[PDB]
Design a protein around this ligand. Structure first.
Ligand SMILES: CCCCCCO[C@H]1O[C@H](CO)[C@@H](O)[C@H](O)[C@H]1O
Ligand SMILES: CCCCCCCCCC
Ligand SMILES: *CCCCCC
Length: 205
């Protein structure tokens, strides 16, 4: 399974190449939601992955780790850093990754609206509220909240995730949990790197 992330090494330095390779399998899974109304969250994650790749691909040795990108871009472009280039793209990407995490985890934990137990709208909304909303002005909130309102049925979403293979609903859930392990750990380290490096900005778009 190629969306599975590597374990963290002991020094916690995330290698850019394998990271980019693994998360770039995430955007296509937005199609499992069904609707093309979710293209805003999908396209955003995607675009940020591409911008980080654009920098990385110019010089994989120098941009070997995620930390390298931040330190090097600070050297190249001190006045505007961290509001620059791949540093900024990763700043936004982590929030989108956290959104996905907290969404999936909430599903696995079995949180639900008792009034609408086969939807995943509460899961999406809680994910958006904790990960992204505080960084979005009203117009972008309008866009993201319209789309969450097309959240599919839980059973459909899970059936869709496990297409091509023969796997029960709680086998599919077991697979989500497994993915969440190194995925969650990596996200935590990215957030922590942003705080440690004074790279975190809180403006709204
Ligand atoms: C898919 C449309 C939703 C817009 C969300 C916003 O975030 C963007 O904001 C910054 C500009 O400050 C870009 O650098 C990011 O790449 C992007 O996610
Ligand atoms: C929000 C859509 C992203 C889903 C990612 C799930 C991948 C891991 C489970 C197979
Ligand atoms: C089918 C088109 C939906 C477009 C939303 C950006």
């Amino acid at each position: 399974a190629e969306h599975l992330l590597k374990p963290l090494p002991a020094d916690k330095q995330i290698e850019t190449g394998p990271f980019l390779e693994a998360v770039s399998h995430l955007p296509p899974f937005f199609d499992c939601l069904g609707s093309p109304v979710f293209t805003p969250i999908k396209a955003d994650i995607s675009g940020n992955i591409t911008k980080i790749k654009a920098v990385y691909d110019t010089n994989p040795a120098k941009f070997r780790t995620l930390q390298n990108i931040l330190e090097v871009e600070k050297e190249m472009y001190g006045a505007e850093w961290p509001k620059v280039g791949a540093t900024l793209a990763l700043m936004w990407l982590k929030r989108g990754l956290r959104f996905i995490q907290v969404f999936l985890q909430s599903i696995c934990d079995g949180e639900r609206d008792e009034n609408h137990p086969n939807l995943i709208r509460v899961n999406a909304t809680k994910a958006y509220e904790m990960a992204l909303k505080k960084y979005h002005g009203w117009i972008v909130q309008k866009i993201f909240q319209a789309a969450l309102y097309a959240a599919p049925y839980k059973s459909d979403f899970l059936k869709a995730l496990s297409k091509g293979q023969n796997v029960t609903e709680e086998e599919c859930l077991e697979k989500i949990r497994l993915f969440l392990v190194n995925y969650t750990a990596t996200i935590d380290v990215i957030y922590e790197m942003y705080t440690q490096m004074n790279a975190e900005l809180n403006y709204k778009v």
